[PDB]
Design a binder for these strands. Structure first.
Length: 232
RNA sequence: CUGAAAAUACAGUGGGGCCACUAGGGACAGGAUUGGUGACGUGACCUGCCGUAUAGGCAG
C-alpha cells in the first residue's frame, strides 16, 4: 500500500522490480504521503535507462540528472505531449498531434472515460519515453490520486524539503515550479485531421458529422491492470 | 455512407545409429419363469380340348 512497505526487501533486484512494477500504469497506485524524498529519488532515477541504473535508490546520479538543466528541460518539454486520448493507437503514423479534453457525458448503460477521474498518458517520440516517466507517473498523495506536475503546481511547500534534501537551490526550484505550472497540459485539440486518423459519417441534425474515434488512456490502463490480475 | 478507402509472406532442407519384461498362482457354494390365446370366406387363377399319362401342350 505505502512506498517503503516494498522497500523492506533486502534484495535490491526484487525491490527495484516491485518499485518499477508499482509506478507503472498497469498496476495499483502506492501511497507516498509518508515518503516524499525517497519517492523523488526513484521517480527521477526512473528517467534513466534500465541498463544505465544498477539500483534506483542511488542518490548521486539522481542529483547528476537534477543538477543538469539539459535533463529536466527534456522532462518539461515532454509535459506538452500529455494526452487524455491516444491519437497514435494503433497507427503511429499520426504525426505530431495531442488530444487533451475533459471526460464526456456519463451514460448509465455504456462504459467510457466519464466513469473515472481525468488521468493522463504520454505519446510523442520513443527517444524521450524515459524522460516522461518523471512527470506522468501517477502516485497516491494524502488520500488523493496525483502526479508530480499537479502536486508541484499548487502544493509546493510540502515538496520544498523533499527537493532541497539533495541540495537543489530555492531560486532554481521556484523557477522550475512556475515553468512547470505554466507548462501544465492545456485543452489541446488538433487544428487539422491527420491522413492516418480514421473518420466515419454519423447522422447529425439534418445531415452527417465526421467522427474520429480515439481510445481513452484511463479505460485502457484499467483493462490492462484488470488483465494482469487475471480477472476475466 | 461500416475504427471508413487500398493491400501477393515468401524462396531452400536426410533424425539418425544400438536394445531379452521376467519369474509364481484353485472363482466358489444355492436356485420352479408361470398363467391365457380362432389368419382369413367382397374372392379374379374359370370352363373345356389333345394326349396311354396328376408327363407335356393348347382355345376363349
Amino acid at each position: 500500500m505505502h512506498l517503503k512497505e516494498l522497500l523492506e526487501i533486502t534484495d535490491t533486484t526484487e525491490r527495484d522490480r516491485s518499485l518499477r512494477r508499482a509506478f507503472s500504469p498497469y498496476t495499483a497506485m502506492i501511497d507516498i504521503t509518508g515518503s516524499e524524498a525517497v519517492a523523488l529519488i526513484i521517480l527521477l532515477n526512473l528517467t534513466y535507462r534500465k541498463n544505465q541504473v544498477d539500483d534506483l535508490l542511488d542518490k548521486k546520479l539522481a542529483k547528476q540528472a537534477l543538477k543538469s538543466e539539459d535533463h529536466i528541460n527534456k522532462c518539461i518539454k515532454e509535459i506538452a505531449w500529455f494526452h487524455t486520448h491516444n491519437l497514435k493507437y494503433p497507427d503511429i503514423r499520426v504525426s505530431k498531434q495531442n488530444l487533451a479534453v475533459e471526460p464526456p457525458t456519463l451514460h448509465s448503460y455504456v462504459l467510457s472515460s466519464a466513469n473515472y477521474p481525468k488521468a493522463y498518458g504520454w505519446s510523442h517520440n520513443s527517444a524521450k519515453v524515459n524522460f516522461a516517466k518523471l512527470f506522468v507517473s501517477y502516485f497516491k498523495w494524502q488520500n488523493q490520486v496525483s502526479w508530480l506536475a499537479q502536486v508541484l503546481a499548487t502544493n509546493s511547500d510540502n515538496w520544498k524539503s523533499a527537493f532541497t534534501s539533495l541540495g537543489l537551490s530555492v531560486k532554481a526550484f521556484k523557477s522550475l515550479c512556475v515553468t512547470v505550472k505554466n507548462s501544465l497540459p492545456e485543452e489541446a485539440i488538433p487544428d487539422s485531421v491527420d491522413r492516418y486518423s480514421r473518420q466515419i459519417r454519423m447522422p447529425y441534425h439534418d445531415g452527417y458529422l465526421a467522427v474520429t474515434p480515439v481510445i481513452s488512456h484511463v479505460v485502457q490502463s484499467k483493462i490492462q491492470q484488470a488483465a494482469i490480475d487475471k480477472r476475466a
